[PDB]
Design a protein around this nucleic acid. Structure first.
Ligand SMILES: [Mg+2]
Ligand SMILES: [Mg+2]
Ligand SMILES: [Mg+2]
Ligand SMILES: [Mg+2]
Ligand SMILES: [Mg+2]
Ligand SMILES: [Mg+2]
Ligand SMILES: [Mg+2]
Ligand SMILES: [Mg+2]
Ligand SMILES: [Mg+2]
Ligand SMILES: [Mg+2]
Ligand SMILES: [Mg+2]
Ligand SMILES: [Mg+2]
Ligand SMILES: [Mg+2]
Ligand SMILES: [Mg+2]
Ligand SMILES: [Mg+2]
Ligand SMILES: [Mg+2]
Ligand SMILES: [Mg+2]
Ligand SMILES: [Mg+2]
Ligand SMILES: [Mg+2]
Ligand SMILES: [Mg+2]
Ligand SMILES: [Mg+2]
Ligand SMILES: [Mg+2]
Ligand SMILES: [Mg+2]
Ligand SMILES: [Mg+2]
Ligand SMILES: [Mg+2]
Ligand SMILES: [Mg+2]
Ligand SMILES: [Mg+2]
Ligand SMILES: [Mg+2]
Ligand SMILES: [Mg+2]
Ligand SMILES: [Mg+2]
Lengths: 79, 69, 330, 151, 59, 131, 228, 59, 32
RNA sequence: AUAAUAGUAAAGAUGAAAUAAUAAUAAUAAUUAUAAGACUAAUAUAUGUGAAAAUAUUAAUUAAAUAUUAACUGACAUUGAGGGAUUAAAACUAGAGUAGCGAAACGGAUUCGAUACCCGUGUAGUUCUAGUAGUAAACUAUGAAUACAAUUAUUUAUAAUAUAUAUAUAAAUAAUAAAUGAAAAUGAAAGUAUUCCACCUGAAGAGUACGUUAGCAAUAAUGAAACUCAAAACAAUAGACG
């Protein structure tokens, strides 16, 4: 009920916008950008809506393995 | 003699590919495929495929039932 | 070895929906006729509806009184109503026609009352527990809950504000079979029974088996209402008069068939002798050699026409009467 | 606050059946103390302004002009009754407010009615019409109609 | 404009039809016949157009 | 089962036309959530007059506020919700339509899917990134 | 009269296998679309760990918004569970899960879906479902015909199994609750059967006036008097 | 039970990071037979089976 | 068959129906 | 059909006319408003779906349905006597219901007559719920299954050359070559073949008569022989008629 009342207040707030279906829009690039970023950058994704590859990397230690590899080249090896 | 309304062909949402039944809550969109009195144009007039025409009429008749149109 | 899925986990209302479907099935259910093998000629045309849900035991003694037999004789000892006589010993049951109290009452059982044609329902008040008898409607079964609003809507709901008039749950709390309300708060077109005439009087009309009336109009300025009764007559009634929702039980009472004269004698009906069989000193139809009607207009033994002669005629007619009954239209 | 009634519009309605024709003339009227009264609600008041009442002033059929039996429904009879109707409007001098016209069925009198209206006959009346429409009745299913005729 | 609206909405013909009752089978046969006649007229239009074009181009 | 409910609610006491829609939506949402259900989203459509003077229970109506709730629940609850809506004098008309789910678990309401946005995930991502 | 009678459609009452499958389909936390509670819960935990350490490691410079309420995450979880809960879905999914269970309990090896026993188990589940449906839609003659056809098809496959591998045939029919007679006699789901086995618990057909049946019944029930 | 896996993992992670190590850590130590707490322990506890099928398919 | 050939049998059935209508009382008496 | 209003003497039905309707709130036309019991405009082609009968007003719950590849089973198949289930109208037995339409019946008219075609009042029926019965020009007048045979057009789903609507499959519908046929015509069959199951041996008598089975009843299934005759039919030609 807490979520229900919060969302009801937000929606039926007068200041909030209200779709009358009387106008039309002028005419997806952002969605395609998100999908392609998840498609190429894989587990290295920084996007809010990551894919299952991140969880796969966790269960595989791939992310942690790469992270310790790079950190060991950086601080210990001074590179 | 060859006056063909290809502007409608370009600008029609139904022939774009969208599901006509998806518009059952859009009387404004559906009203463009009915006569002034509310009758539905035949397929020879609408130009829609058989599947699209059946879905469109289905959506229209539904809208009428609910009362939005 | 025993295995059963005990994880019903029925959702709060899923029980309500389930019992709604069960109510629908039990309403769909029909009632059959009892027919005994005609080992005797008196059993050939004996039919009686059988209700397996009726209660086979005795009634509550505190709600009954011995029924005195008069025999059709008045205080002078002379027969004033003929054809009425000996029959099975009976007790009259003090059933409620006013329903003044109010509150929720659960129906404990449904019983056969020999003094009437409709079944009766034993009630028990949820808060005080007092027992009472009322006329059972068609769908009433042991287990249901009913109430009367003759006194009015209760403080329990008024203070709670949940079922108060503001959300108007009163409509759906009203138009449900069994409960009792004034016509003022019964909506138009509702099928009702046990109708009164006055705001302080008991239910008088539409009280027999399978009988009902419909609310046709409301006139708040005249504090009146128009109701059509089972006779087909539209009549004025007090707007604050009593009425119960639903038809009176035992709809099939009219399809019953007594198979023999002894059954009438048990019920308390003595033989009827036709006028034509009598002598002229007796019924006017009497006399005549052979079978003859004597060219005498069909009339009672006391000279009153028996075919179409309006008996209530002249100034002394019904003051509260919008439209007369079909009277041959049906 | 006292009730008062003033006419706001007028409506002329014609039913042209196959055997006869009917012309009726009515006035759409409105009270101006109704809204002055206090305690009313917006929904009710504006519902009233969509459903103003109407009162019939002139009403005549083709029988008032001497047409009997088969002559009741025909082109010339409709023409005559329409002309008589317009003369009645002119003489009772109710041409000051706005006029509307409605037609209900497609008998032989349909053509005659508006031929009279737009001819020299109805030249005065036509000057006040702003809305012309049809209100014929049809069935989306409905009750069964009589059987075929085996003429 | 009124006349065109009723003609295109087929209000008059509908009113004529609804005066009397017709059996569903007869209704179906009439519908099929009318559809066939309209189809045939469209095809004839097309063929006549072809004839006119061929004449215009000398065939 | 996913269900899309379109509802028309009467407008009275013009001071707060949306108050009745608010109250009814709160009630049915409480029903759904208490009945082991989850309302997917509630979106209003605005104050719009009806095509005809529409009558219910001997009450004339000309305009009604329109709202759309996409909610997940069972057949039984769906039924009772429908019956409560039909009973309620606060509603003029309403209808529930089953939103199929064999292909996709996440389905946006018919309105957005008509706009071309086929998922609540799509809507939320657009809000987060574009805005 | 002293022999055992088995319903050719439903088989012996309270078959342990059938009742166990029905109980499985009605357990506390069961989901549709092949989501087992343990897998989904631990997958959500894995998701949270994934986001946690990914943000922590990529954002060594603290850019994370903050920690989220455990109650809020539990609300998300319960949302998913209500979406996927079995008793909130169709009975199609229930039949599908039951068919999966029957296949795994009758398959000769992992991946055997065409063996006669597995076929029979799946048709048994479908037959149970359609019988439950007919019991509420007694006028549904199209579906009654479909049910009749499916029962006869089960008989056909079981007869083939008897002709090929008798041991598995007897094993499977006994496990299902069908006897050799019910598999090897003509069957039509006629009103006679539907009344004898009380498919609805009511009378469906009437006898001709000839009372030879009662005559023989009583002439053999005369044992109390001086007959035998 | 009065606790869930998500909150339990949260508790063990908090113990690993801050180092509080309360009685709840011992309780969960017997709940999952994990005598020691570490990121490797968390990952091993939350291991999925799908990885096994992936590796088998690769083989 | 052709409509002609059908009429030849239609008359048969018509006469049969008249027969069975007019022999009603005799059939009733014979059948008790 | 009810009531309100206002407004008048007609209206409403006919090829043309008359019965049952109408000025005493006072009818048809008109606007409100209160009811009921049937049907469901356009889309629409019965396209599609269903074994057939049948099916196109809105949602829902349940019951199966289409195509590809994956794996599996492993000839488990076709037909199907007897049997079994469903089966439009019209009928029949019980409840409710009865607005509109309408067998009968009574009156108008038309006629030489009119036991009718036309008009009025309208029963039973038509509606829903329980059932009984199992026939129709129940027709594509064409039982089912399998393997095959030459071409065009359209629409249908899915498969890509690859710049992209140019390419590949199958399905249905139209027109045909062979082939068949008494011809009309059929044309993935009424062709080339193969396995089954139901029928036919001239009309007329006759789907009648007598058993029999079944039904509450209509009635259904099964179903014969005297006495007659050289008849009796189908396709297609010319015509003469309308
Ligand atoms: Mg008496
Ligand atoms: Mg007595
Ligand atoms: Mg008597
Ligand atoms: Mg007597
Ligand atoms: Mg005597
Ligand atoms: Mg005397
Ligand atoms: Mg005598
Ligand atoms: Mg005329
Ligand atoms: Mg008539
Ligand atoms: Mg088979
Ligand atoms: Mg033949
Ligand atoms: Mg009128
Ligand atoms: Mg239609
Ligand atoms: Mg077809
Ligand atoms: Mg065989
Ligand atoms: Mg057979
Ligand atoms: Mg039909
Ligand atoms: Mg009857
Ligand atoms: Mg007649
Ligand atoms: Mg039957
Ligand atoms: Mg016959
Ligand atoms: Mg036949
Ligand atoms: Mg046909
Ligand atoms: Mg076939
Ligand atoms: Mg087959
Ligand atoms: Mg040839
Ligand atoms: Mg041959
Ligand atoms: Mg041949
Ligand atoms: Mg026979
Ligand atoms: Mg010929």
């Amino acid at each position: 009920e807490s979520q229900l009342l919060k969302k009801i207040d937000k929606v039926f707030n007068d200041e909030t916008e209200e779709f009358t279906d009387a106008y039309d829009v002028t005419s997806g690039n952002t969605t395609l950008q998100t999908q392609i970023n998840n498609a190429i950058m894989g587990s290295l994704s920084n996007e809010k809506f990551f894919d299952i590859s991140l969880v796969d990397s966790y269960l595989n230690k791939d992310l942690k393995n790469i992270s310790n590899k790079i950190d060991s080249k950086l601080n210990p090896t001074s590179n | 003699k060859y006056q063909a309304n290809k502007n409608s062909n370009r600008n029609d949402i139904m022939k774009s590919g969208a599901n006509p039944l998806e518009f059952y809550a859009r009387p404004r969109i559906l009203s463009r495929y009915v006569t002034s009195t509310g009758r539905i144009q035949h397929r020879d007039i609408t130009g829609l495929s058989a599947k699209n025409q059946r879905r469109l009429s289905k959506a229209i008749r539904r809208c009428q039932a609910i009362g939005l149109m | 070895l025993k295995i059963i899925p005990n994880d019903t986990d029925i959702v709060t209302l899923e029980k309500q929906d389930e019992l709604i479907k069960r109510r629908r099935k039990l309403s769909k259910e029909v009632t059959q006729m009892k027919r005994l093998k005609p080992v005797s000629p008196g059993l050939r045309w004996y039919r009686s509806p059988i209700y397996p849900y009726l209660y086979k035991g005795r009634p509550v003694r505190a709600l009954t009184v011995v029924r005195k037999k008069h025999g059709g004789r008045n205080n002078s000892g002379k027969i004033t109503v003929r054809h009425q006589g000996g029959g099975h010993r009976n007790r009259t049951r003090l059933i409620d026609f006013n329903r003044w109290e109010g509150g929720a009452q659960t129906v404990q059982r449904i019983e056969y009352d020999p003094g009437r044609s409709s079944h009766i329902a034993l009630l028990k008040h949820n808060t005080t527990g007092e027992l009472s008898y009322i006329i059972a409607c068609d769908g009433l079964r042991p287990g249901d809950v009913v109430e009367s609003f003759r006194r009015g809507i209760p403080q329990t709901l008024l203070n709670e504000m949940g079922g108060k008039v503001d959300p108007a749950i009163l409509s759906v709390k009203t138009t449900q079979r069994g409960n009792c309300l004034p016509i003022s708060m019964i909506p138009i077109g509702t099928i009702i029974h046990n109708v009164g005439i006055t705001p302080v009087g008991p239910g008088k009309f539409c009280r027999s088996a399978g009988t009902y009336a419909r609310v046709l109009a409301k006139l708040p300025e005249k504090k009146k209402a128009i109701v059509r009764l089972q006779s087909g007559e539209h009549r004025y009634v007090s707007l604050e008069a009593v009425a119960t929702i639903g038809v009176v039980s035992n709809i099939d009472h009219q399809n019953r068939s007594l198979g023999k004269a002894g059954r009438s004698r048990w019920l308390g009906i003595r033989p009827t002798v036709r006028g034509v069989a009598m002598n002229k000193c007796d019924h006017p139809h009497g006399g005549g050699r052979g079978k003859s009607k004597s060219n005498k207009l069909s009339m009672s033994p006391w000279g009153q026409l028996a075919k179409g002669y309006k008996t209530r005629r002249g100034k002394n007619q019904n003051r509260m009467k919008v439209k007369d009954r079909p009277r041959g239209k049906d | 606050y006292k009730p008062k009634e003033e006419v706001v519009k007028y409506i002329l309605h014609g039913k042209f059946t196959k055997n006869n024709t009917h012309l009726t003339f009515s006035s759409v009227v409105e009270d101006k103390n109704f809204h002055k009264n206090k305690g009313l609600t917006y929904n009710d008041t504006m519902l009233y302004y969509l459903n103003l009442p109407q009162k019939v002033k002139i009403s005549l059929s083709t029988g008032c002009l001497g047409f009997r039996k088969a002559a009741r429904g025909e082109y010339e009879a409709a023409f005559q009754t329409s002309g008589r109707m317009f003369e009645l409007i002119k003489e009772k001098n109710m041409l000051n407010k706005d006029i509307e016209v409605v037609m209900d069925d497609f008998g032989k009198g349909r053509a005659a009615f508006i031929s009279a209206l737009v001819g020299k006959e109805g030249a005065s009346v036509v000057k006040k019409v702003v809305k012309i429409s049809d209100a014929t009745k049809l069935k989306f299913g409905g009750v069964r109609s009589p059987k075929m005729r085996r003429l | 404009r009124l006349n065109r609206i009723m003609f295109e909405n087929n209000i008059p013909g509908d009113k004529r039809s609804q005066r009397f009752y017709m059996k569903p089978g007869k209704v179906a046969e009439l519908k099929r016949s009318q559809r066939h006649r309209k189809e045939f007229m469209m095809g004839f239009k097309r063929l006549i157009e072809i004839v006119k074009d061929a004449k215009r181009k000398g065939y | 089962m996913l269900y899309e409910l379109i509802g028309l609610v009467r407008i009275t006491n013009s001071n707060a036309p949306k108050l009745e829609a608010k109250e009814l939506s709160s009630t049915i949402g409480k029903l759904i959530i208490q009945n082991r259900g989850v309302v997917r989203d509630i979106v209003p459509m605005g104050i719009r007059y009806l095509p005809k003077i529409m009558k219910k229970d001997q009450e004339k109506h000309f305009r009604a506020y329109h709202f759309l709730m996409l909610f997940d629940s069972s057949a039984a609850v769906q039924s009772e919700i429908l019956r409560t809506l039909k009973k309620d004098p606060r509603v003029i008309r309403s209808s529930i339509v089953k939103v199929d789910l064999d292909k996709q678990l996440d389905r946006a309401s018919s309105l957005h899917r008509s706009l071309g946005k086929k998922s609540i995930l799509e809507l939320v991502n657009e809000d987060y990134q574009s805005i | 009269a002293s022999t055992d009678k088995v319903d050719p459609v439903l088989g012996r009452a309270d078959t342990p296998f059938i009742t166990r499958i029905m109980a499985e389909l009605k357990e506390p936390l069961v989901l549709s679309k092949g989501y087992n509670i343990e897998e989904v819960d631990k997958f959500l935990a894995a998701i949270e760990s994934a986001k946690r350490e990914r943000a922590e490691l990529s954002g060594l410079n603290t850019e994370v918004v903050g920690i989220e309420d455990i109650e809020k995450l539990e609300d998300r979880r319960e949302a998913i569970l209500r979406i996927l809960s079995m008793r909130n879905s169709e009975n199609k999914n229930a039949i599908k899960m039951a068919v999966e269970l029957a296949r795994k309990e009758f398959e000769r090896f992992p991946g055997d879906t065409g063996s006669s026993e597995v076929q029979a188990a799946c048709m048994t589940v479908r037959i149970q479902n359609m019988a439950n449906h007919i019991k509420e839609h007694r006028k549904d003659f199209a579906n009654t015909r479909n049910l009749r056809i499916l029962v006869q098809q089960r008989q056909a496959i079981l007869r083939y199994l008897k002709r090929d591998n008798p041991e598995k045939y007897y094993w499977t029919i006994q496990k299902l609750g069908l006897n050799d007679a019910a598999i090897t006699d003509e069957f039509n789901m006629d009103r006679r059967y539907m009344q004898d086995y009380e498919f609805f618990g009511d009378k469906i057909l009437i006898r001709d006036s000839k009372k030879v049946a009662n005559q023989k019944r009583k002439e053999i029930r005369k044992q109390k008097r001086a007959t035998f | 039970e009065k606790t869930t896996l998500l909150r339990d993992i949260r508790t063990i992670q908090d113990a690993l990071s801050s180092g509080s190590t309360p009685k709840e850590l011992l309780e969960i130590k017997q709940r999952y037979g994990i005598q020691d707490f570490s990121q490797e322990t968390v990952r091993q506890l939350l291991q999925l089976d799908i990885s096994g099928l992936e590796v088998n398919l690769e083989k | 068959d052709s409509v002609m050939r059908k009429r030849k049998k239609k008359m048969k059935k018509h006469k049969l129906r008249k027969r069975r209508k007019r022999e009603k009382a005799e059939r009733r008496k014979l059948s008790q």
